[PDB]
Amino acid sequence: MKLQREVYIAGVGETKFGKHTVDFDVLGREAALQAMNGSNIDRPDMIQSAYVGNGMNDMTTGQAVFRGLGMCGPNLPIINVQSACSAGAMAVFCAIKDVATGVTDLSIGVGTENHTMHSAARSDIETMHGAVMTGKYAMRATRYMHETGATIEDLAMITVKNRKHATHNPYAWFKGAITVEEVVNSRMVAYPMTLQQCCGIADGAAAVVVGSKEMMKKLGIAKPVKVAGVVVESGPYHNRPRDITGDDITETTSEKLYEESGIGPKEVNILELHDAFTIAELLYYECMGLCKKGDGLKFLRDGQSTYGGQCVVSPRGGLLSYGHPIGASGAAQIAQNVKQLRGECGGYQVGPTPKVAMSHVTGGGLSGTEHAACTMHMLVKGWG
Amino acid sequence: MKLQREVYIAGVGETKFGKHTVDFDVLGREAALQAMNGSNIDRPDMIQSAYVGNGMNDMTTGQAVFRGLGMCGPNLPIINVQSACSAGAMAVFCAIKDVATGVTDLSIGVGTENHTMHRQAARSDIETMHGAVMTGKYAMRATRYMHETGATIEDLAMITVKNRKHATHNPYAWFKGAITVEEVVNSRMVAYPMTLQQCCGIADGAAAVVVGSKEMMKKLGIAKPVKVAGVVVESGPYHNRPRDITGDDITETTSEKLYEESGIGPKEVNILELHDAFTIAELLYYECMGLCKKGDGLKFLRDGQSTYGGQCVVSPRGGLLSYGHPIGASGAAQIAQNVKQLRGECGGYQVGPTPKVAMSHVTGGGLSGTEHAACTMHMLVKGWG
Amino acid sequence: PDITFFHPDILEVPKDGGLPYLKGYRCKKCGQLDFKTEMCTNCWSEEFEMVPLSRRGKVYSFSDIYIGQQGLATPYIFAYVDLPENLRVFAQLEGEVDTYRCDEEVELTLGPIRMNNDNLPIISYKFKKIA
Amino acid sequence: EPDITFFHPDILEVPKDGGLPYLKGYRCKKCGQLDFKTEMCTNCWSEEFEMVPLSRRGKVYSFSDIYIGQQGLATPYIFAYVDLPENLRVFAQLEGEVDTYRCDEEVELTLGPIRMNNDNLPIISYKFKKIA
Ligand SMILES: [Zn+2]
Ligand SMILES: [Zn+2]
């Protein structure tokens, strides 16, 4: 979506990700309050609109989130958004759209989910035949291994790297040192996907406050992060043979994001993507144009997706380290990308401070579709 | 929300409402297709954005809806919306916003739900802990109104009698025809004074609304484009102070904002589709929306001012009391039926002097300390000569 | 094990044998009175003073429940009980169906509101007719 | 009511004469698109189709040996994308043992149990197996 006027990110909020004993509403409240305080918003009536992303908790997620902040009322139209895993990012997108069009000058996007305190019908043809998401992604890995000569050890390197990235991140769930051997030796789910190659189910929330250039000055934002672009697509449906080492929707979303923003994939310093499985990340180096068509394996092996490489991928530790609260991941990626651009990530801060940050989530996908949805943001340094 | 440019409704879609053996995706597809054909859409690629409302079926409702129409892809960003019963109306509000802002020139809003094909608040919510049920919450509003106005259970029953009368010749409604006050009053008591016949049922159905700019209405050759005079979304205030429950904080303010933005007052409204989940909700909303003064809702109903010979035909499709209530669909279903009334297309149940002003209202949810979690209201007017 | 009491932050039961009471909290920064919260909904302050609430209230409205929450024995009664401190409490009413009226004076009492997950009663506050 | 024991008369034909079973495809009479059974054509929205019998032989485009699968399904099991010469991809279970299939391996249609129904009776459907 082309931005009719400039949109900047003010404060961001992020809860710890893991197993929580406080529900989605408390987590969402914690993340929205932090984003507001980070925007120099100490009072409930500054925000003009709110969009909240959730998957399975409630039909009125945002209203339950802002209830305890005294923000629900005639001055806060709240709309809750779903597209499985895309929800938290669509929440930020909807807030950005309100600002970009001049409907508002200041809005908030919240992504929240709590799973641990509490997918497709049998009528779906693949589900009838016994499909499981891990097996669907494992078929992408098996095909990639056949075409490139990639091994299960190469796939395991994604978990090793992303847990390494998360080591000094207090927000992450699983972090630190894990060897290739431990990842490869963990319980087989669907060959070649082992338990340590799959993102877990987690609880958490994140929030992003967006505003006009004038609103950034009004609020006294020191380091406003510019929204260079944001794209939402739905996934094409057909029953024809597809190159599953490709991703139809991720390829078209990323190319539309590059065309609209004027920023190419080679300029991206950090990238948060949908690493629900090790293979997803590895395939996305190619799908997003970080490298050429069969070069994802070489890109990983040469250290191009870690510290000192072309693009630090999953610097927060991704889904493989945070786990995946459906409604929260899309928003959480943006909150972490903003803090990396601001040089605020201490022990896990990316080396030459990044100036260009990209994020990607997908979500859903019935038989015949790669994913049901895709949301991608391009964020840049907006000060200096 | 003030419209930066004019927005008009092209085609509308509506399925039959009742117990369906086809899921939310099939119902939504039927509704979407009916609305597209109604807009003279021969190239689906013309629709630039889609918003779909749902409550409990799926996280990717719209994607499942547009999948069988070959519409999912780089040309159709789909966003699914929820706010309980507001979802269907929020879907068309989001479509209207895309058009009003110039993000798109042609958008679609779909509301869909199937409840009966599937086996369907937390105890942590203080009122839920103490045994609160939605029927009891609304029955407390009725008990208070009866205390203040002298309204009887027979007066409350008249809402079901009238709505089922309105729905008689409506093939889309689930329940309809003649029902006496006695049958409504004698039906199984749920929470005094709410009897089973005074409560809307759980139903399956879908509806869709196509929205476009005025240039898009000329381009598509729309004979009777329905103007979006206004549309408002609010969230419900939260507090633990005494409130007049015969009033409705959010409905009063959403209503008033809708009148201010669209320079159209409540006395100009010819037809109104309401959130009649309970007979008392409709009766209270005559006052909350300003159709009559505070305390005069009972007199307004008794004098027949909310039916065919009156000031405003309320629930002319038969409302939630005749259609039942598929959470994600009702908000969109009210808009599709209001459009067909303005077009003079409801033969048998067509409102007398063809309406020129149509208002719609759905609320949805509401934890302890809120009257409702959300409210969405649309003001629609004749857009042709 | 599941809770057998609802809730220490809202209902004070004195060990000394003194009459139980509902607990209110007044924000020290904006003066708003509310039930227990981590932060004030009006101003976001986290500084409060506990205010004991009146044991007597008025039935603002009520409903005799015949088809209620699943697990709860029927019929039962619930209501909005308005306290003089301008605070509304939702609570079950003790007694029989078709006996309560709007604006009727009631008094705080302790009783089982529901069975917990271990099928043991949860003791909480309810209101009853004054003798 | 009793749950289904066969999936599905619209996708799988078991000839009356006792002949070899086959997958059924449908060609839209208006735009010529070939697809599996649908109420309306995804390309042009027409509701007029001609049934086209599909090849009994295909290629394993990709597969996965499933150790932790769908709830209720006996493990291990195998599933795959089977590409047919008509340029149509079918998702199906593969008969046989784990660590024995490869990408681009030729396979043949076969009938077998895919899962237990709600009455705990097997649902017979299409599967693919190694060619003898
Ligand atoms: Zn305060
Ligand atoms: Zn066709």
Domain range list for chain C? 1-131
Q: CB of B68 within 8 Å of any CB in chain D?
A: yes
Residue of C nearest to A65 (CA): C41
Element spanning A89, H or E: helix A87-100
Torsion of CA A328, A332, A335, A336, to 10 degrees: 170
Give the number of whichever ligand sits closest to the CA of residue C45.
Answer: 1
Q: Is B144 annotated as a binding residue?
A: no
Resolution value, angstrom units = 2.0
Element spanning A213, H or E: helix A213-219
Chain A residues touching residue B77 (CB < 8 angstroms): 1, 231-234
Inter-chain touch B70–D42, beta carbons under 8 Å: yes
State how far the alpha carbon of B246 is from the alpha carbons of B143, B220, B222, C63, C82, in Å: 10, 45, 42, 15, 16
What tokens does A145 get? 């291994």
Q: Residue C88, exposed/middle/buried by CB under 10 A (0-12, 13-18, 19+)?
A: buried
Q: Is the peptide bond before C75 cis (omega within 30 degrees of 0)?
A: yes
Parallel, antiparallel, or unpaired: how do β-strands B78-82 and B49-53 relate? parallel
From B130, B139, B147, residue closest to C102, measured CB to CB: B147
State how far the alpha carbon of C89 is from the alpha carbons of B367, C86, C118, in Å: 14, 10, 27
From C82, C90, C122, residue closest to B368, measured CB to CB: C90
Known catalytic membership, residue A374: no
End-to-end CA distance of chain C: 37
Task: Indicate the number of domains in chain B.
Answer: 1
What tokens does B115 get? 């409840």
Parallel, antiparallel, or unpaired: how do β-strands B205-212 and B8-14 relate? antiparallel
Inter-chain touch D88–A242, beta carbons under 8 Å: no
Inter-chain touch A69–C37, beta carbons under 8 Å: no
Q: CB of D39 within 8 Å of any CB in chain A?
A: no
- Tokens 């509301």 locate to B111
Inter-chain touch A76–B235, beta carbons under 8 Å: yes
Q: CB of D102 within 8 Å of any CB in chain A?
A: yes
Chain D residues touching residue B117 (CB < 8 angstroms): none
Closest CA of chain D from B70, distance in Å:
5
Contact partners, residue B7, CB within 8 Å, separation at least 6? B96, B99, B100, B211, B212, B213, B227, B228
User: How remote is the CA of residue B73 from the centroid of ligand 2, in Å?
Assistant: 18
Annotated binding-site members of C for Zn(2+): 27, 30, 40, 43
What tokens does D118 get? 């709600």
Element spanning A145, H or E: helix A133-148
What range defines the domain where residue B40 resides?
A: 1-385
- The C-alpha angle with vertex B237 and arms to B235 and B242, in degrees rounded to 5, equals 150
What tokens does B293 get? 């003064």
Q: Is D41 annotated as a binding residue?
A: yes
How much is the CA Rg of chain B, to the nearest whole Å?
Answer: 19
Name residue C50's beta-bridge partners: C25
Task: State how far the Cα of C70 lies from the Cα of B20, in Å rounded to an integer.
Answer: 26
User: How remote is the CA of residue C41 from the centroid of ligand 1, in Å?
Assistant: 7
Q: What are phi and psi of A359, to 5 degrees?
A: -135, 150
B18 residue type, one letter: G
Closest by alpha carbon to A279, among A364, A182, A131, A159? A159
Question: According to the 3-state scheme, what is the secondary structure of chain B?
Answer: CCCCCCCEEEEEEECCCECCCCCHHHHHHHHHHHHHHCCCCCCHHHCCEEEEECCCCCCCHHHHHHHCCCCCECCECEEEEEECECHHHHHHHHHHHHHHCCCCCEEEEEEEECCCCCCCCCCCCHHHHCCCCHHHHHHHHHHHHHHHHCCCHHHHHHHHHHHHHHHCCCCCCCCCCCCCHHHHHHCCEEECCEEHHHECCCCEEEEEEEEECHHHHHHCCCCCCEEEEEEEEEECCCCCCCCCCCCCHHHHHHHHHHHHHCCCCHHHCCEEECCCCEHHHHHHHHHHCCCCCCCCHHHHHHCCCCCCCCCCEECCCCHHHHHCCCCCCHHHHHHHHHHHHHCCCCCCCCCCCCCCEEEEEECCCCCCCCCCCEEEEEEEEECCC
Inter-chain touch A103–B370, beta carbons under 8 Å: no
Pair B279, B156: CB distance under 8 Å: yes
Question: According to the 3-state scheme, what is the secondary structure of C10-21?
Answer: CEECCCCCCCCE
Pair A230, A376: CB distance under 8 Å: yes
B178 residue type, one letter: A
3 state DSSP class of A77: coil
How much is the CA Rg of chain D, to the nearest whole Å?
Answer: 16
Technique of determination: X-ray
Contact partners, residue C96, CB within 8 Å, separation at least 6? none
Inter-chain touch B133–C98, beta carbons under 8 Å: no
Inter-chain touch D36–A189, beta carbons under 8 Å: no
State how far the alpha carbon of A143 is from the alpha carbons of A247, A250, A301, C12, in Å: 13, 18, 19, 65
A108 residue type, one letter: I
Closest by alpha carbon to B81, among B108, B52, B48? B52
What tokens does D85 get? 């010469």
Contact yes or no, D with C (3+ CB pairs under 8 Å): no
Pair A140, A179: CB distance under 8 Å: no
Chain B residues touching residue D45 (CB < 8 angstroms): 33, 69
Contact partners, residue B237, CB within 8 Å, separation at least 6? A72, A73, A74, B249, B250, B370, B371
Pair A265, A254: CB distance under 8 Å: yes
Which phi-psi region, left, alpha or beta, contains residue A364 (left: φ > 0; alpha: ψ -120 to 50)?
left
What tokens does A167 get? 């080591």
Residue of D nearest to B29 (CA): D40
User: How remote is the CA of residue A53 from the centroid of ligand 1, in Å?
Assistant: 28
From A60, A73, A102, residue closest to B365, measured CB to CB: A60
Contact partners, residue B322, CB within 8 Å, separation at least 6? B163, B164, B166, B167, B170, B173, B174, B175, B176, B315
Q: CB of C99 within 8 Å of any CB in chain B?
A: no
Closest CA of chain B from A354, distance in Å:
29
Closest CA of chain A from C44, distance in Å:
7
